[PDB]
Paper text:
RmlA, a glucose-1-phosphate thymidylyltransferase, is the first enzyme in the pathway and catalyses the condensation of Glu-1-P with deoxythymidine triphosphate (dTTP) to give dTDP-d-glucose. In addition to the active site where catalysis of this reaction occurs, RmlA has an allosteric site that is important for its function. RmlA exists as a dimer of dimers and is functional as a tetramer. As a consequence of its structure, the active sites cluster at the dimer-dimer interface and the allosteric (or regulatory) sites cluster at the monomer–monomer interface within each dimer.
Residue numbers in the entry:
A (entry chain A), C (entry chain A): 2 to 192, 196 to 293
B (entry chain B), D (entry chain B): 3 to 192, 195 to 293
Write the structure that this text describes.
Amino acid sequence: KRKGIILAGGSGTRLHPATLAISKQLLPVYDKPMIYYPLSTLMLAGIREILIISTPQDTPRFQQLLGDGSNWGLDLQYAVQPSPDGLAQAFLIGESFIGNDLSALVLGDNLYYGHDFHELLGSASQRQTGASVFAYHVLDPERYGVVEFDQGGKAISLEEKPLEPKSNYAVTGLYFYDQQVVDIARDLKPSELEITDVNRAYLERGQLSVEIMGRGYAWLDTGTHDSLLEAGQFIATLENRQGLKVACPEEIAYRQKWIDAAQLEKLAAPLAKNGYGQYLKRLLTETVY
Amino acid sequence: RKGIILAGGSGTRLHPATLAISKQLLPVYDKPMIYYPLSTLMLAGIREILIISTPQDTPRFQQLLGDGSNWGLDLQYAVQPSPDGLAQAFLIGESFIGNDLSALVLGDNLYYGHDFHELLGSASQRQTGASVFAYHVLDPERYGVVEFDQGGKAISLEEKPLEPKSNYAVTGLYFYDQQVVDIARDLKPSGELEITDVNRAYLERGQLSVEIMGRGYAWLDTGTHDSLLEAGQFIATLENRQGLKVACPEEIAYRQKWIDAAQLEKLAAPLAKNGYGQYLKRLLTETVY
Amino acid sequence: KRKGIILAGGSGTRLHPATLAISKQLLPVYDKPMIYYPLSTLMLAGIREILIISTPQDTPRFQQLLGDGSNWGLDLQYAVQPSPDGLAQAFLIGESFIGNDLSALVLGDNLYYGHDFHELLGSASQRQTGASVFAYHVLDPERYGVVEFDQGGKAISLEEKPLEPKSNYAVTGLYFYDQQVVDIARDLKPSELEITDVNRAYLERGQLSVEIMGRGYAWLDTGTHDSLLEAGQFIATLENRQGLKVACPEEIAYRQKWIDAAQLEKLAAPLAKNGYGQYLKRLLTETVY
Amino acid sequence: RKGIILAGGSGTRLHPATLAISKQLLPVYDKPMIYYPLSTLMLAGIREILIISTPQDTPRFQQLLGDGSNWGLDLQYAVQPSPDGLAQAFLIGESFIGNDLSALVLGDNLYYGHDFHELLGSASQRQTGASVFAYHVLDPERYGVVEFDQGGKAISLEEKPLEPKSNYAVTGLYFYDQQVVDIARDLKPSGELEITDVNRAYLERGQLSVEIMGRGYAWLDTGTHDSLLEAGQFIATLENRQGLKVACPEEIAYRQKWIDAAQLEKLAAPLAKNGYGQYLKRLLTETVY
Ligand SMILES: CN(c1c(NCCCn2cc(CN)nn2)n(Cc2ccccc2)c(=O)[nH]c1=O)S(=O)(=O)c1ccccc1
Ligand SMILES: CN(c1c(NCCCn2cc(CN)nn2)n(Cc2ccccc2)c(=O)[nH]c1=O)S(=O)(=O)c1ccccc1
Ligand SMILES: CN(c1c(NCCCn2cc(CN)nn2)n(Cc2ccccc2)c(=O)[nH]c1=O)S(=O)(=O)c1ccccc1
Ligand SMILES: CN(c1c(NCCCn2cc(CN)nn2)n(Cc2ccccc2)c(=O)[nH]c1=O)S(=O)(=O)c1ccccc1
Ligand SMILES: [Cl-]
Ligand SMILES: [Cl-]
Ligand SMILES: [Cl-]
Ligand SMILES: [Cl-]
Ligand SMILES: [Cl-]
Ligand SMILES: [Cl-]
């Protein structure tokens, strides 16, 4: 059993004034709230028990959007981050939720797309000891956790936002952990409690799997107003080309058989007037390979 | 002249993007949607403004904008329990309007262009009857449509006609004399109190001024996920080209001399880390024609 | 041995006046000529001997861009289509070029992206008898050749631009053929000589492989001014995110070991001032997984 | 006043996109780039226009535009053997200019906004000295930069200064009296004949008019792959919103009464199948204010 955490603790003042009224992870990417994308990621990894961590202020808005998850065959719980004291704090806040189980942490503002993404998630989820992370070639590795590889393609170092990156390989905001993570997190000293320190702890124990997320995958940037807009245009282009949605949670739950035709039809009813509800209706009758 | 921004529900049209929060709190590029119509009223020289929103979202608008005193405005708030037409704004706003002239702007309407201040000025100076703006669009059937005679006189208004008489849509910006509240009270639901019925009342009295908003102005659509995205790209292109912002309320208040250098500097302080605060700081030292 | 054909015969007057001065397939998609994308596709399928079919007018422009291909470890030949009399005409024009070999036809305006695209091409290229095509879920199947599947997922019919498509599965502009194709093409009667008639001929002989190109692949539309612009924005988003190019022929030739470090350095020299040349230089020193 | 469009080489800056054909023949959305500056000269009331291009591309410009008689223009052509500065336009154009007033526009400059015809009109009516336009940009170091004194008088011009005195760039639109050819003949290479040197010559004689092009105008960048794409999206957003075209030369000629209904109908005929021809047909019957 692997449990999911979505860290949706806003973005401080970075995207103000756009994010003054509402948390970053409730802003739409094209046609759906940002959080639908990482939620859909956990769902594709087969995870149904998910903790959403947000600000005290925005927890009710996340709860109004997503409920307890029962409508999508999920169990959603909620926890608050009073102060953004690092990503690794997710494991202390989430300690009781995690218990003795395996976990996956996804950032609430990370968008993924591509062929065999389910297999890339599957390989990390099946490793039931140590930690699994993904390395993706980016233009601006200095913004991220950077992985250095030896001539043999083995991961040998992790640096958080290095001014002189050793590679162009950034660690994506998707992390798989065994039962050691909470204890590793409790022993961290502030630099913020750094996720890169958690990942370096596993690396030093020789228990960090670093899989390449290939250039054929899109790992999208929602860090700036410019990149948020590009992410919107990217999803819009795919969806209007295909007549298929990216990270429609109702669709993923239906295809995982976590909800049946009758439940999906009920979810379509109140959205029947717009394209999203019409999309859910079409899913009941169409064969999609 | 007193201002009203109608920032009510779009029902379920943009769901699930708008499930968590009102359309008019979503960003267009770098700032909340409501900054654009607010900036429009400010450019028309209006400082006393009623913001009408859903019962749920009124506190979010209040948290974003306060009483307006920081921007040299007087902001008041009212709720629209149910979206029963745009004309309801004048009943909700009746006590706020009192015996004064008024301007209604829709909370999801974006305007841009040269001498926009003069186009607003001409409508605002006409102290009797009503002034509206007609703009050539591809899809007039979505709007209030103006029909003109061979002499270019306005002779009919139709709300979302199946067979539009012209390609000229009425924009979501309306100037009214002291007759508007009484005209609104006498309206019967169509099940909505139609702004087009208010405007037809003035037309039949021969007291409706219909000024052409030329093709050299951008009147932008935020009605669909596609058009919301285009509006973001449109503002981003102008702002990144110019190093100047469209509809920055702090800037407009400063340039109208509604706040001084000292007040603007104080507003910059809490945003000093991001581009928006840095922009407000640059405004103190730079000459912009 | 499999030989490649790129059909780049313009677009008649469909995209006029944009295409009045130059052929569609010489228009850029972001940073590189459209034809670089299908050329890169054939190169990824391991094809080095490629016939480019274009108008008499534009052949010299294609020749000025691409030469004989020797700089990229290719052998490029050129043939003219006097009149656009259907896609299947490619096999009559290309008859002597093809000889007794296997072939692949790609449309000069088709863009592909995704993970394991090389494997999808590999599976079609290794089938040395019959024909292989790809089916992709689209919004507007009525614009394309449409594949109908039985309950078992076997292809049972092909229709060219049906007013009432049997599925949302369009045949992409990428076709693999055995030595039968030229003879099948010679026996066709005008409806234009239809590629769908060629593919139906193989289906009726039970020699048509239809592989699904999954929703995790991008098959992009360059049919309209709107879709051409979206294709540009799509590539720009991926390339600026990754610091890696999509369909850089110099890169693909280098990674296939069709050219060495010394040849790549020579190709970089005349482009050294711009980002494209700087990209080719960085390829000499960087490990990319 | 006679017009010159300088549509010469951008060297290798946009290679390989511009390897096959000149920048100014690439489309911006739905029409060749050169349609935009041509439309600019036409809006300034200029019918006699010299098009300067590379030796290679002159025939392509001639094939696109002819002698202009179909649009009520007189188009002549000249070649720039080597891109040795913008001021060379006046030596190449010397015989074409003769004893007349002139306007130079860059072939890759796009303008949009309300009363643009009046901004052009004011410069065109000044029959002595030179008129240029100053526009606030983020990156003034890329352009000719105007410095103003406390009174808003222009006091210096610098070409691509490392330390810009202001954020005010000179746009690629220049109005000149009969002095310009002689001023140009006396210029020494910097290794380019600089337009900024021509403009500084007029400034030192106190005969340079520098009018502000306000933030309500769009002056668009086609200097980079990124900015070319944004220009396309910008025009597409306006045209799809309005159902009206920006810089349709047939429309501008018709509205200036340089061609009649019968001539416009003939121009529509060969384009009748696509949206551009259908647009020209609609212009014959529709009243547009
Ligand atoms: C485009 N993708 C995607 C989808 N593509 C995944 C196809 C590959 N696949 C097969 C299976 C069978 N277990 N699971 N995944 N699917 C299909 C799906 C099929 C079966 C179960 C779940 C989802 C989907 O419904 N929505 C999707 O959005 S994706 O790149 O894998 C993705 C992207 C972002 C979030 C979640 C999934
Ligand atoms: C780009 N525009 C605009 C601005 N352009 C307006 C320039 C025309 N103008 C001159 C004056 C001088 N009294 N007022 N307006 N200005 C300048 C401004 C100067 C003085 C007072 C108010 C605003 C501004 O600060 N922000 C702006 O966003 S705009 O197209 O007219 C506009 C569009 C939508 C909302 C608000 C403004
Ligand atoms: C993003 N892709 C892509 C690339 N991705 C392909 C990676 C998968 N792969 C491994 C191999 C080893 N034979 N070949 N392909 N590669 C890498 C590459 C590696 C080895 C050989 C050729 C190209 C590349 O250089 N340019 C690319 O543009 S892609 O989706 O397969 C592609 C898209 C469009 C045209 C050609 C390829
Ligand atoms: C949107 N603009 C524009 C147009 N807008 C200009 C309207 C202002 N105007 C009124 C008049 C009446 N003599 N002339 N100009 N017009 C209208 C027009 C009407 C009469 C004569 C010429 C053009 C047009 O046909 N195409 C246009 O593209 S524009 O911003 O001024 C422009 C920008 C760049 C090139 C050419 C025009
Ligand atoms: Cl890949
Ligand atoms: Cl106008
Ligand atoms: Cl700034
Ligand atoms: Cl897939
Ligand atoms: Cl202005
Ligand atoms: Cl039309």
